[model samples]
Target: MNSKCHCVILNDGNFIPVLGFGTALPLECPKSKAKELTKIAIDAGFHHFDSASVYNTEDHVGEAIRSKIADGTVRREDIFYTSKVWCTSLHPELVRASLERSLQKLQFDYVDLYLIHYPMALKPGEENFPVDEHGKLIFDRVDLCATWEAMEKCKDAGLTKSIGVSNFNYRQLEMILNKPGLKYKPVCNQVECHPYLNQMKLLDFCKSKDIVLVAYGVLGTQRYPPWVDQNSPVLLDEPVLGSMAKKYNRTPALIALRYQLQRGIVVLNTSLKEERIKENMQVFEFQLSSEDMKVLDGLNRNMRYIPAAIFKGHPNWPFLDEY
Candidate 1:
């Protein structure tokens, strides 16, 4: 269970840091401070970042990267940044536009990894998440294979080094894999993976396709609103993780992260505090035994923290796979 301090080679022949800093926290609390916090992450040896346009933190993430560049801590090539095209722009005509806007926010010539945020497409519009007067999300059905072609163009045109999709199930992936002109196969599939929800089937499937399974919620998101249900069980509070933390003399979060790394899944974590950011970097310092790995694996309850219940009834809702 040792950490890969270097990178993961994608199907497209590019390196992505195994551990990535997550920017979804930038919008959580004290939202204005993400720039400096991300700067702290860079100072603490973070070279990869996970961000999305809908998260509204790409500018903050860019600010941190720029600050590091100015201070000579890292060069543009030293960081492997990831940004996602929101559901609003999954249309083939709007895909590149969405990516271009994200690049403008990130202020980078190219991103290391760019992902379609979800399998489902929402109504095409400037609004982030358009909804009807009755409070239902406006769903727009677009051929995802067509949207993927635009992503391939983004990579070929050098706007992004590699392109992939997030929250896609096996059937959804088959759509792209079986596409008529899939110029490039997806290099990764980013999804939720924590002790409560192991995602074993999907992980195995992705591995079979040579697609790296990139996991967020490794420590389990603490009930974020508008997505995750507040009543969901807290991942960090699980007795098994707490006991293992005590046995390993490490924090529960570290144990959780180590568990995923042991399973060969690239992990993303976020924290706004400097001490926690440094603590997270310490993940490479400890090694978990095989017995402990099985212990953590047994804690899976098949729960998804961010199920996007608002779009539950949509035709392309990802959670339907039960994987």
Candidate 2:
């Protein structure tokens, strides 16, 4: 395979593989399995791996990458590994500590990219989701620009190559882009996007700012009780996508993934099964017609899977915006 075909250059001039393997596993899955699955994904030609500290699988992902490098299957530089700073660590003082901790876990000198996991902040502490006595998420009110400043410092300190935000709306993005003494603009904005929640408006804004829009949930999402709405319809089961798949001789998942790729969105996919992991790479081989793209566009319902609804009351809750 021509490796160049699978990557897009970010605003920072770094090449990120268009397709990334997501290392966020479900609660019931063994965390150790992240190591096994990441190894499998690398063997199957995945060069980009997305992991977050909140996921609690970084150790496993780290081991997998280290073992792969030790065996000469791939070099550390050949891999584009992304680690995220969780909401709880958004405090400026805690940001560098968090990246250092992740590097220690991954046993790497630096990460290819580090992101603000979410726009909102949680209480800075050991709990990923710090909750009050009433079982509500305790929210913090850190200035996002201050947090972005710290993220820039991480980049300056050589802890991460690039810095960006996730789950941020246009207004929030503007906050960083318009910061009075901004040193570096965010290279990307990772968001949950698919035919259902196709973020066209936000994508346009990011494009205007020369920021890549990295998409997760391109195949929709599984019904995880805390994060997802149980009654949400399955994205892969949409008849339009099914028909498109039949016409293209591909699976609905591939068609959905291809739709995003054709639109120049970087996509992330997670699968525990080896066959599906290999099968997903086929997304690079297909093209969608403009008409088909528009048809898929009409499927947008403004639906969201990981709305982080429990934190809706937080000052920085991003979903309240129309985007």
Candidate 3:
């Protein structure tokens, strides 16, 4: 509805903001802090909110949304909430129930978009992470196509306005596209996309298919969980990015986000700090030149921040032993 914000049109014709606030932090984050930060983000004009069942902060997010709605800052209909059905709950019978669980947690009747969290599914009884002696696959036998079919049913049944996939690779998406009885095509593919690990090929494919690409880790997730590699190279500290930031007279993070947004990809920038959140929202105020886009594109190193190595033990490990 708002073209200035660059809302992308889904195959179903619903509009989703090109930028969103990712709510993927651990549940340990205080509810007060979550509410405060979320309110600040809303005040700064972020209408799309991304979350997942596994994030375990839906209640906090719900509270924030309700508070904003109550004060007339934003209506519940104004927020485009996106969440995923975790792998373990991908079975046909569990799909609706899983969405209901998320709905209850989010204090919403329905979500704007629901994604298949990942293509891989754990064995009948396995946790998110499973290991073996040789550090190879152990759990096995889950049908991704079956899961996708259920997701389609979600849209048909009015559980979500749109259904899509996340953390999926080209091969997996191809399989889903080729599957039979697919009533709905995935409208979006959420992935970890940033300047350092730009997924050009994947993004291009999605664009050609009219499937929007929603990027996470757009700020390189500098303050992510401890397990996210504290010693990892700081993407913001890259020399080329710094030089480009100077040229643009903006921070590297802003430049990095602009690179993705201008390329027709939806970028999610997460931040708990009020200042950073304000800065992330300002990404739309500036535009990057074609040369700047090319320069940032060159920073792609295929660096994956959230590796699914732990899924090695799963039968349908999305990221198998080989790339």
Candidate 4:
């Protein structure tokens, strides 16, 4: 296995960089600022970009990548791009069209990895929540297994180099993995992972299955939407993490990032701040001790920043409710 940054081999025999630059930003961030920030990240040695159709910022991210490629700072092929197909577009007939739309938005021939954004489906013309009176989600009866099959088709058709799932727990993953005709096993699983919500069990399961675990919300999502609890604990402000930062002679954010990298899990570090983005890339330069890892592991309060509040009324309302 390649030792560079602890690369994880995908099921299709491709390696995805363990650290990724996440494109999701606070909705208020201006497009111009996002473009500048992304350019800084790419120039600072970030080779993987995590994006999604629902984020509505792929255009800005694409511009940054194009600029970097034009300057010879990085080649298009050197960059590993991952994007997700929204729940509303999970039907078999619509899968290809959805990816095409993402390709146009990203200005890429094809993505390196494509994920089914969620395990659930939404009815046509029913993108937003507000489930029907009987508690049924607006989306049609698009089975997630069927959607996973479509994603496998994308891989077979060469539209995507790899296919995977996001926001799926153990049961959800079991459902797909147990399906009889499942051709391509999910190469990765993207979820909210950080010191606060360490997600040790899921990470272990993904590793046992040889599936890459990609983490989002790695740096403490302080800029999360306002609808979230205003008084939620600031992960970076936690005393224990701060102490670890001091001992490591690094910022709290770096300590948080190193915790994940040292654990051999891929982390998605998101930021619109140029300095923070640059700082985030330096996790590769240092190693965390076993004691430090244990302390950071102890920081898991199962704290989740993005609580899928938008999916409240669905059958899986409060996706982390059982967590």
Candidate 5:
């Protein structure tokens, strides 16, 4: 299918589909749901899959992929599977442990793209949410350069074909670039990007560094717990987006995701229904005009849904930058 045909090459020369399948379930949804949804995505011609350790769906994701392989639906080599290392395990020593755990749970020899889930590191442990006596969260300070070195080793060992960072600011990325022993540059930066929070500045910066900006929350951010506000304006409800959706004969989500693809950002998206999953793939069939793209770009509300603002007071708060 077209979804399998269309792809983007990263700085490292590895390719990922422009349209990605995401299996990050809602907080209320069970991990088992990931298996079915991922199966549907694969059947719908999706080859790139995005998941994370914090999502707790690696096992389900692995099951779906292996089931397809066993049934002779798709070869393991054609599938681009992605997973992230959580904040609690970002210490240099813990990075490989987290990757090993993810690989064990995924039942895969290696991931196509493995990412450092967030910029900040937490105290090394299995508990993703680490807190102290008063119930306040504990923060760990580790040189991100050292963490990058650890991820470099994973790439060298073939645990992941490519390595990247997520939720990193320009300054934080600069830190890696200036490292004395920099081995490999990050292939991508996964972050929240959509029509509302267009991430224009960050996208530009990443392009300058030849780092593909892989976007999560492209249909607007998922309400991931304490980081996002429940009362925030819904992205699909934006009047301009609604009008544009009608203009393109597509949903607002398709419009948002298409906008990013046209701008060269690799978009990771999810939908609970089979129809929506198939519909999201139809973005490749149409193109938005220069005028329409301008309108979509104008919808940038500067609304960052998952700023991780709860940890804004910490030394490594990534959202302190203009991007």
Candidate 6:
């Protein structure tokens, strides 16, 4: 794969860069850092950016991209930006508005792609994590097909060039794909994927349907106490990946990322440090051998770093499914 010229065509004919820079921040990191890091990423040749409404970093991300454009570093058309609708706004009536809000924050007319952040739904309101007096998440149940219909409408109205989903199980994805009078199939399914959680079954299902499998957490993630399991084994510490990295004369992070790219999975990489941000682009510079790929495949233990434990009680909790 060419490091500077690799992108996958989505089902909608829109192309997404194979390697994306993720802008979601950890709890301890200042959200304002998104601007500086995003600028560095753009200068380093990252064209696709993954962000979400809940991340609260859209303003800075937009600033960085627009500044880069102003400096002639890139053009709007050359950048593929993605923003997601949070769970609280998954209701059909609220979906379009949620995307519009993201546009307003990004100061862009339309995002290159938009996604339903999760399969589950929370109370619709200004609060991203709406909760009751008892401190429990107030879960709202809505037929995802209806929300998908609204997503299609966002595409039709030009609010987004394409629409897809994230953190959804196979059954939830099928529900929308098989919806009656479905106008558009989801262009991709973004989820937590890495050597430890390769998502082979879901990737196979997505492949058969022509939906791209966009992998997040490709380099693992910062353990946010509210969303991630603190005790889970760190993914980059796996011996197989370290050995592969040594063989390839690369960092373990690059080996983990390249593993997914070789499998045809688009990988999301996040780093606030300049060196790591620049180093991650090397994912497109090397190829893993079939034998090494198989060795990495054996590293799958079906573990998830970001299990969303807080939402486990929701009726639509997605992790219970085997895929």
* Two-way lDDT contest, 1 vs 3, winner: 1
Q: Candidate 3 local accuracy as lDDT?
A: 0.80
TM-score of decoy 5:
0.96
Top lDDT model = 2
TM-score, every prediction: 0.96, 0.98, 0.91, 0.92, 0.96, 0.97
Error in Å for residue 96 of model 6: 1.2
Supply every candidate's count of residue pairs whose N, Cα or C atoms clash at under 3 angstroms. 0, 0, 2, 4, 0, 0
Select the stronger candidate by lDDT from 4 and 6: 6
lDDT of 1 at 107: 80
Write down the TM-score for model 1: 0.96
Ten residues in sequence with the least summed lDDT for candidate 6: 1-10
Off by over 4 Å in 5: 1-4
The TM-score of candidate 6 is 0.97
Give a tens-digit lDDT track for model 6, residues 245-295. 889999999998888998889989888789999999887788888988898
lDDT of 6: 0.89
Evaluated against the true structure, the overall lDDT of model 1 is 0.87
- Model-by-model lDDT, in order? 0.87, 0.90, 0.80, 0.80, 0.87, 0.89
Compose the digit string of candidate 1's lDDT tens values, residues 32-71. Answer: 4668778888989998989898878888889889989999
Residue 295 error for model 2, in Å? 1.2
118-233: candidate 4 lDDT, tens digit per residue: 76667644353436788655745677788888888888888899899898888888888899987988998898889888888888998888888888878777556643566778
How big is the positional error of residue 43 in model 3, measured in Å on the Cα after superposition?
0.6
Task: Quote the lDDT for 73 in model 3.
Answer: 90
User: Judged by lDDT relative to the true structure, which candidate is superior, 1 or 4?
Assistant: 1
